Design a protein around this ligand. Structure first.
Ligand SMILES: O=c1ccn([C@@H]2O[C@H](COP(=O)(O)OP(=O)(O)O)[C@@H](O)[C@H]2O)c(=O)[nH]1
Ligand SMILES: O=c1ccn([C@@H]2O[C@H](COP(=O)(O)OP(=O)(O)O)[C@@H](O)[C@H]2O)c(=O)[nH]1
Ligand SMILES: O=c1ccn([C@@H]2O[C@H](COP(=O)(O)OP(=O)(O)O)[C@@H](O)[C@H]2O)c(=O)[nH]1
Ligand SMILES: O=c1ccn([C@@H]2O[C@H](COP(=O)(O)OP(=O)(O)O)[C@@H](O)[C@H]2O)c(=O)[nH]1
Lengths: 331, 332, 332, 332
């Protein structure tokens, strides 16, 4: 008897690896619900003889029993080979398995696609699938994902205790994002200023206020003073990735300010149906609404962000999926 | 401005009160999820002046802050006047309210079907409701329940660490209800033994072999050695039949024995799609199937009930609604 | 018969109230330990007939059952009759009472003394007592505390997930208390500057700089840029100082900077043996040390304050007493 | 710098392995407190090469981080080799390490003593040690355990929800010990019955009554009905057993019945100061005391056993040590 719930969780990354922190946050929610961590360290697999890799995995999995539910946050970023072998280890236990997709590698870019057959093959060894969007599920099914049981994540949480402050109507735009991933910054043409929070040492266009990498808590603290959240991606290419959930979008709303997002985003409806800000087409549509928007137009939009965001702040999108995933994994 | 979640919880009913312990169980789940208790004692409120009363409530709610969330488990059994008075207090606080329906008082027994409209009245003020089933919601909106966000319970959990003994093919039928609430018991006609667990003494058709009320643990221990669980009503209430979730349906499945229940029950889809037992017309239909089933087809059903029940034994039907309810309360 | 643990937790006070904060905060640990809140609202008491109020007490306490455990965080700041009568309610239950002393209102400021004998009366009605320091238990004994089982708090935790930024050597002293309760502040003379975090802006010595009351979170960040935490009281309150636990003490150490405290203060050996700042005898011994301190010496001292402070940031002083209190309340 | 607590958890033993059952239960408690499991599987270490093992260990510790804290339930039963190396692994991380002793190999009997120096070697790499009895710590320090912070366990908890049946005065002695280890059983000559609960098929002396192994919950329910619980040694396995905490002792008390224990065993002061049973010289002293005891005396003895066992049923002896151990690991 006595079933337990385990969740994989990666470790050993740069303190700025967003993938790692996103897994770490989910795992944090998991523990409070009583679930148990399956630690996974990120290392180079080829340093391992198959037998060594095997028994490393036996070490990761030691605690497991015919019994349990395992939540697999994919990918481990130890390359596909690791995910593949991780799963077979899992599948030789008498367990139900939830795969929690954070990224889909063969869809990260064209010509990485070939990995799809392998990927889908191990995706289909799971009993329940949690995907960020309904869109993601539907293309994943277009490549042979057979799994009957599916959950939509909808939106990244952002558990925190930051102080929200009184929010001014500042006609600024926040963007905590590495500039060498998003070209649109280096192209900043507009009279409204782009606050850019980045560790990387360099200089930026004339009305782009470069700001050194703040610790998250402080970042949430500062942004809560006003302005807007920019959710842009990924510059030109890497855009059909209208699939996954942005982590900064959640990071914005938790601060308590409205957001701006480009049309077609994953789980767009959430933003409309909950008031959180504007969905626009071009970068230029934005400048217009930031420049030409009413002060109490802004007043409202905040009041709602802060109405909506205790979900994000106490982590309820995550609680939701970590609970139904399991439930649907039995029933 | 920091959200916490409270849930209302009964205290002071008898050892043998299902209403209280179904609520206590929910509460114990809520605690493990981090939620906080608004304790509520059951008493005649005729002994309160509608102001001493207000202050008692004020002391029930003194932990509450502004955009916390309250889960109200209804009913309180302190009478409708309390229910709505408890409730009205919550509306003062600028919070979001979850109404968890254990029972709708004015449907159960057509004495006091009249209280309905004051019930609905204080129902229509919550922000989301969690109800036994969709058919239960549907009948409620027919009475004017204007609440948009709904959410279906589906099944009672029965969280426990009780030992499951190997199930063998006792051609027994188990039944831990109360003979003069479920009076189809005094009408036993069939050559299949009916075991009945209850407070009331001295009432026996003949093959109804009755036993004294046992602590929940033991019941589930001994029921696990084999046989079938039965979930049935009088014709008295075959409408409320099709609405509620039964506690002993959950109390059977956690014992890891198959159940037999009446076609038209709320959420029979769960019994079917998870093959947890037989869905059947009349009680004769049952006895036939209890007689005609062979050893191996019973092995499948037990294995299926036992594939299924850690869900019920670890609190997940509850955990489910305790988490989505709070979620849909903020979302739109 | 299943033991649940309860803790009291006052509410409704000003978001600036340290009393409420040091209670909500402990309660918050207790919740995560699975304990349950007994919410309490702070209000002026005699808008209540002795019978009305008794029924609001009945509402705060409805969730209790015999053989539970209740932790009374005292005082409630609802005056001493409330402490007395609350406690009286707890004693008609078959329970064990942990009395957790956050303050002793009689030994606090003079004139409050007269309530001493009544306070000891209801102190002596609990099973285990939790006091800030052994020295405080000793004084309570001299005034008639007859409760056998004592347990020392030691220090306030300061749970937080705030950023500690790189600290060292700002040659400045930090002080987040109201100036009106410590007026050593106004007689500030010495050339090193005093940051003061407070509600007011009344008065202003030259080398004293003030800041508007920042939310706890942001404060600990800033303080974590270096400088010293000064734990001081105005010397009418030294009788008390040698007994209580200072919350700002923890707030400093939580930010990750070394402290300055006065000799004789409660649980000083804590500071000594974990090397978290200086113990000095006057204000002037202090400034002397704030100047004349090597960058290397400050280095290590910070290093020590941060070897140490996950204790207070994860709640372990609170977790410690909350566990042992309930234990000794049963063991003998 | 976010401190997390980890605890090692042995797995993959037979369901009758008390070692595993004890480590599992501590861990379940730990998990409730927010601590984190380091799972470990039991297996022949010889199937691994240095490289293989190093990496198996790597995978066990993947989640580990600097500034975390790890609690090592020792021994793993993967042999000393494995224990030494697991510890070497842990010391590589900049963490604080609590060592929870369940057994000490080089003391299990003579000739195993050569293992002492290697055992002590790695024991001394700990910051805090938790032993069952103060007696245990004293003996360890006579061999070179230089770890300055020690904490005492005292007694096994037994988290359970068994129904405590009404307890009659059954002049019989329960004993769920496996005979092959406890040979005093075979020597049973006494007119008082001896319930021996054992999975082994091997017939037993006359007024010994053999029960097949039963689930722990059923056992506890059975014994709750009444009678006495015996905690007895063997004779050679005795000195070493004066240092341990018996697990079945806690089984009794949680069951709700008094106990009978041989003079000198670890932590007997808990039995005496809490009324838990009799402490006696030989086997006969027992039968005497069992025969020559009145009914009201037994009501007494039970009522205080049931006074006391919420500690064990809710896991507080463990909660104590899991909280204070960790606290003491940061706190010089
Ligand atoms: O100075 C900073 C800027 C970044 N962030 C965090 O790092 C995340 C980076 O977002 P990323 O582009 O990696 O995720 P995405 O939104 O693209 O999914 C932000 O949301 C912040 O929470 C931070 O902690 N400090
Ligand atoms: O001897 C008994 C008989 C009843 N029960 C419990 O009380 C419930 C009675 O079910 P009830 O009819 O009151 O609930 P319903 O199924 O009608 O919703 C059973 O499920 C058992 O869990 C029990 O613990 N011991
Ligand atoms: O701007 C501020 C200054 C104070 N504090 C908190 O309020 C407490 C005031 O301490 P108090 O003098 O009331 O208690 P003591 O430390 O003397 O026990 C400090 O510790 C801080 O934690 C705060 O939250 N914001
Ligand atoms: O039928 C049985 C017999 C024993 N036990 C368990 O086995 C334990 C005793 O094991 P052991 O003698 O090894 O513990 P010790 O007292 O020596 O520490 C009991 O307390 C029970 O928990 C059980 O679960 N069912």
């Amino acid at each position: 008897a006595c079933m337990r719930t385990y969740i994989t969780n990666l470790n050993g990354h740069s303190i700025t690896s967003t993938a790692q922190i996103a897994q770490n946050m989910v795992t944090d929610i998991a523990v409070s619900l009583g679930f148990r961590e399956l630690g996974i360290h990120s290392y180079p697999i080829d340093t391992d003889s198959p037998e060594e890799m095997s028994k490393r995995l036996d070490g990761i999995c030691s605690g497991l029993r015919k019994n349990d539910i395992v939540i697999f946050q994919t990918p481990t970023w130890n390359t596909t080979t690791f995910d593949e072998k991780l799963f077979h280890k899992l599948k030789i236990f008498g367990v139900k398995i939830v795969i929690f997709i954070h990224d889909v590698v063969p869809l990260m870019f064209d010509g990485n696609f070939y990995l799809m057959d392998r990927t889908i093959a191990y995706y289909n060894e799971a009993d329940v699938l949690i995907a960020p969007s309904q869109a993601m599920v539907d293309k994943l099914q277009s490549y042979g994902l057979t799994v009957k049981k599916i959950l939509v994540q909808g939106m990244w949480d952002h558990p925190t205790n930051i102080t929200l402050q009184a929010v001014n109507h500042k006609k600024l735009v926040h963007f905590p994002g590495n500039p060498e991933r998003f070209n649109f910054i280096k192209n900043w043409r507009i009279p409204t200023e782009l606050h850019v929070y980045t560790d990387h040492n360099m200089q930026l266009p004339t009305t782009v206020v470069k700001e050194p990498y703040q610790s998250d808590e402080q970042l949430i603290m500062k942004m809560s003073e006003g302005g807007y959240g920019l959710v842009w991606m990924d510059d030109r290419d890497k855009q059909y990735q209208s699939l996954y959930c942005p982590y900064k979008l959640g990071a914005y709303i938790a601060a308590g300010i409205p957001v701006i997002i480009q049309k077609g985003i994953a789980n767009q409806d959430i933003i409309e149906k909950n008031n959180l800000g504007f969905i626009i087409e071009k970068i230029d549509d934005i400048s217009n609404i930031v420049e030409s928007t009413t002060e109490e137009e802004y007043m409202e939009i905040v009041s709602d962000v802060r109405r909506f965001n205790p979900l994000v702040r106490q982590g309820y999108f995550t609680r939701k999926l970590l609970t139904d995933a399991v439930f649907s994994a039995l029933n």
